[PDB]
Amino acid sequence: AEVTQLSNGIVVATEHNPSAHTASVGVVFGSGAANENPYNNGVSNLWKNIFLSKENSAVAAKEGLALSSNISRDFQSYIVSSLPGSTDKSLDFLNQSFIQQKANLLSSSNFEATKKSVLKQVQDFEDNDHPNRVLEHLHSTAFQNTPLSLPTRGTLESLENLVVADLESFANNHFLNSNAVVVGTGNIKHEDLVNSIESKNLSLQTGTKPVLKKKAAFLGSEVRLRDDTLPKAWISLAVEGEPVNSPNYFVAKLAAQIFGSYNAFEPASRLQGIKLLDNIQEYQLCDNFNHFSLSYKDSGLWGFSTATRNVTMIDDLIHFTLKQWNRLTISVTDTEVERAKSLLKLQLGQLYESGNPVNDANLLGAEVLIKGSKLSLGEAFKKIDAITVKDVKAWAGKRLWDQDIAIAGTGQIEGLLDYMRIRSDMSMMRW
Amino acid sequence: AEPEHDERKRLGLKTVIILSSLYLLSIWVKKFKWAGIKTRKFVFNPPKP
């Protein structure tokens, strides 16, 4: 439970844990899909793919190292996992790929083979992963003509028109030192890693800063991807949520826990202490749903996603769900809040403390890049337990009550009513 | 023949003012409630076989 972070020439962040069996090392840059353009959209995802290319991956496999990368909206990460003893050989492969081979990975035979793979990759996503496809379009319409609208995997049209030069241009503008953080998770000590880093000098493009842009903004709107050939309807609906480092960061996440997630086929899920379940189970309004409180640097999204085969009652699904959310402003109970606290801790714990260091790296990296530090799991619980019904009400009355929404859906959505009908349900009539 | 004349025209004045306002007002409310539909936009991408 130690969050150590020091700065020499580069900012080093680590979180050591005795028993772990393995150690993960990697660099996390403060720029992701939110930094791209509509035309070079997908460059970051492309970088990730060559970094994991058969060539670069085989070089690490001989050495007994495993590679992992993750492209997000606000950040980007390249991670190498190793045994606690080879904590130095991971750094050799890291530097060898970001300075030495930052020209060998970009060969005309490797690039074309990779491009052909991310194309079949992004295509497969759009053709079959409907729930994530819908969630991606939700960001697209909610944050249209703004940084958060760009999809992480990039679009097919911007991808196929991408060249080696675009990779370089992005790398020379974002893979900078002032826009990076070296992260180490597993079991290795902070002093053990910082020494191996401060050993090898050479700045390489120091003092250089990444380009600036315009602030992200939420726009109440919708995108309907109707497709009657699909056997279900997948929808996602949300309001402007909370950005990371917001006073209500936790109040929002708790609010989403109150309604939680559901799976009609799992006996135990049908028994949860969620009032909404009394309404949706009678006629089986859906196969599943899940609420979320997505947070990013400039903004976020609070809402839910759902999947259903009850195509003639989608209006009841949306109506009952929105009536429940109305409650947060006027009648949420003490016990609902308390149930949420307990469940929020359990989920927040299971995330922050998993038996996998690669997840730890992403969580640590993403946090330190935005606030310059990481809030300890024990510190979070103190904030969570401090939330009162009055807090949730004040939050809901500002973020949910009579506020614009963003909608996205695909499949048999003929039954999903017009925007104004959904929007009207964001409140209730009163004397 | 028309003993209600003076009073009738006075009531008409109030009636016409209220109704005129209600008319102009409803137009505005209608346009607002319809803005999402009126400016709605479609795109077609022919499905592959």
Side-chain angles (χ1 to χ4, degrees):
Chain A
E2 284 226 1
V3 185
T4 48
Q5 183 251 36
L6 288 174
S7 181
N8 340 112
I10 314 170
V11 49
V12 189
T14 54
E15 188 167 74
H16 47 124
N17 191 256
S19 64
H21 259 88
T22 59
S24 297
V25 187
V27 54
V28 195
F29 301 104
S31 287
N35 296 264
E36 308 180 357
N37 286 120
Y39 302 101
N40 70 103
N41 183 53
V43 62
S44 295
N45 185 43
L46 207 48
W47 264 120
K48 166 190 173 179
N49 284 274
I50 57 182
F51 177 84
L52 301 180
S53 176
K54 181 172 290 186
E55 288 193 287
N56 192 65
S57 196
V59 176
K62 285 285 186 180
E63 205 74 273
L65 275 51
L67 306 181
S68 283
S69 183
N70 180 256
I71 307 305
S72 188
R73 285 189 152 64
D74 301 317
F75 70 89
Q76 195 166 170
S77 71
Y78 300 85
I79 300 167
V80 188
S81 294
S82 63
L83 231 59
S86 298
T87 180
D88 187 60
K89 247 60 198 302
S90 290
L91 291 168
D92 282 315
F93 190 81
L94 219 293
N95 180 265
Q96 183 185 76
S97 297
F98 280 66
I99 290 183
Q100 189 275 100
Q101 284 189 92
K102 211 61 176 179
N104 288 104
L105 295 173
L106 301 169
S107 60
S108 292
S109 295
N110 195 46
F111 185 74
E112 294 304 312
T114 291
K115 185 206 203 66
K116 190 174 288 67
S117 287
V118 309
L119 242 52
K120 187 184 187 299
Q121 193 171 127
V122 170
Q123 177 180 308
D124 230 277
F125 177 70
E126 220 61 48
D127 266 71
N128 313 279
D129 193 358
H130 307 119
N132 291 286
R133 174 179 165 227
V134 162
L135 189 69
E136 199 76 292
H137 275 92
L138 209 231
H139 285 97
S140 179
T141 187
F143 296 114
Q144 61 191 78
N145 295 178
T146 264
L148 277 330
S149 65
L150 291 315
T152 62
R153 307 96 185 300
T155 75
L156 281 182
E157 297 112 68
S158 58
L159 258 54
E160 64 189 76
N161 187 247
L162 224 51
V163 299
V164 180
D166 294 303
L167 284 279
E168 299 177 351
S169 305
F170 186 81
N172 297 323
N173 279 96
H174 303 284
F175 289 5
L176 306 177
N177 190 52
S178 53
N179 191 67
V181 170
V182 44
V183 179
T185 58
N187 73 308
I188 46 82
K189 301 177 177 62
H190 178 35
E191 301 177 358
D192 187 271
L193 187 67
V194 69
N195 287 346
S196 298
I197 296 175
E198 201 161 30
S199 172
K200 310 170 185 179
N201 229 224
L202 187 62
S203 300
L204 201 288
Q205 292 182 268
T206 188
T208 312
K209 302 178 293 71
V211 194
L212 285 302
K213 34 63 184 181
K214 189 204 296 178
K215 15 66 182 176
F218 181 92
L219 182 70
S221 58
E222 61 178 24
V223 52
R224 303 164 95 114
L225 305 139
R226 211 222 259 212
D227 189 338
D228 297 349
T229 63
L230 297 179
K232 302 187 187 191
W234 290 265
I235 98 103
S236 290
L237 190 164
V239 297
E240 180 174 33
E242 300 294 350
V244 295
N245 218 58
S246 171
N248 296 118
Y249 176 85
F250 288 104
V251 182
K253 248 149 195 301
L254 184 154
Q257 193 64 230
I258 294 184
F259 309 114
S261 72
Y262 166 80
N263 183 156
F265 302 93
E266 282 297 320
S269 195
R270 311 202 287 232
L271 307 168
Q272 304 176 65
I274 301 169
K275 294 188 188 306
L276 175 58
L277 295 190
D278 292 329
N279 302 136
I280 84 89
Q281 303 201 101
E282 192 174 5
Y283 289 87
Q284 203 54 83
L285 277 36
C286 75
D287 283 352
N288 54 261
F289 69 73
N290 56 285
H291 294 245
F292 48 72
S293 187
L294 269 30
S295 302
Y296 303 106
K297 178 181 173 61
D298 294 326
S299 189
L301 295 175
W302 188 102
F304 87 129
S305 297
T306 180
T308 179
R309 282 139 53 242
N310 195 158
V311 301
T312 59
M313 299 184 78
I314 297 175
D315 60 301
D316 290 312
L317 205 202
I318 307 306
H319 173 69
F320 286 138
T321 297
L322 268 53
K323 285 305 100 175
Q324 282 305 145
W325 297 4
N326 288 158
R327 298 186 55 242
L328 292 196
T329 299
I330 66 171
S331 67
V332 59
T333 68
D334 286 305
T335 135
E336 279 171 298
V337 172
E338 292 300 314
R339 191 199 79 117
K341 282 174 183 177
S342 304
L343 292 173
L344 214 203
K345 290 176 188 175
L346 177 68
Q347 77 137 330
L348 220 52
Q350 287 181 277
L351 257 175
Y352 280 41
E353 53 176 79
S354 183
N356 189 351
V358 311
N359 294 159
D360 287 284
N362 284 112
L363 302 179
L364 212 192
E367 264 219 71
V368 295
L369 274 166
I370 309 171
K371 42 202 295 183
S373 60
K374 177 186 177 181
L375 197 67
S376 55
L377 192 63
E379 262 293 292
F381 287 27
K382 286 191 180 180
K383 289 188 175 296
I384 295 178
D385 279 317
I387 302 170
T388 59
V389 166
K390 248 193 175 179
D391 294 329
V392 177
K393 285 188 181 183
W395 176 79
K398 221 65 178 60
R399 253 58 157 103
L400 273 43
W401 195 269
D402 192 25
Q403 291 298 321
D404 267 340
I405 56 183
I407 307 175
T410 185
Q412 293 179 239
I413 53 173
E414 179 183 85
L416 178 70
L417 268 31
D418 57 290
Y419 187 86
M420 285 306 256
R421 261 289 195 105
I422 313 304
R423 172 63 219 260
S424 293
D425 265 345
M426 292 307 277
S427 64
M428 297 179 89
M429 299 286 286
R430 52 186 294 299
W431 194 270
Chain B
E2 309 195 90
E4 87 293 332
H5 181 268
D6 298 349
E7 181 59 0
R8 163 163 59 79
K9 294 197 187 178
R10 196 201 117 235
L11 294 192
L13 180 52
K14 303 169 65 194
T15 301
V16 167
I17 286 175
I18 293 168
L19 287 166
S20 283
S21 299
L22 250 18
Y23 174 53
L24 296 175
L25 242 20
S26 70
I27 287 173
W28 202 105
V29 170
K30 180 272 191 182
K31 288 175 173 296
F32 175 84
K33 291 190 177 305
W34 276 76
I37 292 300
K38 291 277 188 171
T39 57
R40 181 173 53 156
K41 302 196 178 185
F42 293 83
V43 299
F44 181 51
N45 286 314
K48 295 193 300 183

